[PDB]
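Thiosulfate sulfurtransferase RDL2, mitochondrial
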Amino acid sequence: FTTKAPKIYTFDQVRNLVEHPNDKKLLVDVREPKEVKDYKMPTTINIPVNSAPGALGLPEKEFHKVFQFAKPPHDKELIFLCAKGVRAKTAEELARSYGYENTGIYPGSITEWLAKGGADVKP
């Protein structure tokens, strides 16, 4: 549980990460899967904080069974996209509580992201 606050990312830094994925980093969408149906930011993984706040503490095999992707290694940088309210802030704090000490945050919401032209951002 480090004291290092998450690195703040901007629209362009997230647009660059979506267009050119980096194996060191992962963009984490913390919205509910119900909201991801409206728009999923490409290359993101969905870890809903309201539904499963202890998700990043799950055992590896059960994480893959519950979410159908690999539990990220603890060296990966998890960049939490904003939702609205304190969801992303809570998910980042929970990630650091589970050994994920390399974290980031994109303060913009999905609505803010789509308003700035993120709908056609693709890899």
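thats it. The helical segments are 11-19, 33-36, 60-67, 87-97, 110-115. The longest strand covers residues 103-109. bye
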